[PDB]
Amino acid sequence: ATFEIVNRCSYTVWAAASKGDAALDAGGRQLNSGESWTINVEPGTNGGKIWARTDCYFDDSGSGICKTGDCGGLLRCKRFGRPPTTLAEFSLNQYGKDYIDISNIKGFNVPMDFSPTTRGCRGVRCAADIVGQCPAKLKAPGGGCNDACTVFQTSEYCCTTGKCGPTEYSRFFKRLCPDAFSYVLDKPTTVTCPGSSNYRVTFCPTA
Numbered sequence: 001a002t003f004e005i006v007n008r009c010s011y012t013v014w015a016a017a018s019k020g021d022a023a024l025d026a027g028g029r030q031l032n033s034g035e036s037w038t039i040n041v042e043p044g045t046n047g048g049k050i051w052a053r054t055d056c057y058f059d060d061s062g063s064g065i066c067k068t069g070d071c072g073g074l075l076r077c078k079r080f081g082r083p084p085t086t087l088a089e090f091s092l093n094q095y096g097k098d099y100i101d102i103s104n105i106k107g108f109n110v111p112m113d114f115s116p117t118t119r120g121c122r123g124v125r126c127a128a129d130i131v132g133q134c135p136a137k138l139k140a141p142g143g144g145c146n147d148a149c150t151v152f153q154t155s156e157y158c159c160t161t162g163k164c165g166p167t168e169y170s171r172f173f174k175r176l177c178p179d180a181f182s183y184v185l186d187k188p189t190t191v192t193c194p195g196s197s198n199y200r201v202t203f204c205p206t207a
Helices: 148-152 168-176
Strands: 002-007 013-018 023-031 036-040 048-053 087-094 097-103 112-116 124-126 191-194 199-203
Touching (some): 002 013, 002 023, 097 112
Antiparallel strands (some): 097 191
16 A cells, blocks of 8 residues: 655654564655655554654664654664654555544644545544643643643543543544544444555645
């Protein structure tokens, strides 16, 4: 499958793509404002994620640090990033279908649109000003708006037992972005696409 990752933000982002235990394609790249990066993701990929990292510094060897979404200090991510990170999530060719969603379960850093570039399904978007409106207790100093599980580490926010409900914090993310997961047991906003669809992830879709 092809994914085109486009940075429409006015600031540089460092895109990342991983399936948790391995990089997807190169795993990461710098995207200046307006740049597009096309990656190939193997069919059958389950649990892939794409996210943006902000305020990164990397040396010539690809080692450094980002203020949001850092994946163990590497430019080329092999593992998932440190919250807060708005997430584009996907599982491809699962019994003839692709499944995509946007999630705020690990917080929010950059607005995003995740849409197919082929026929058969709709896209999803979370482009509200979540960082600007972020509740005081969830604001991350490095930037972004953390989820409540990352901040408080309780069974209720993290849904550790598998029986949690919505919270004042999850309702904040849900009110601003109804089409993104706001907590682990949220009513699914997953979109089913034909198997082998192609996609575009756009950061800052409303410019």
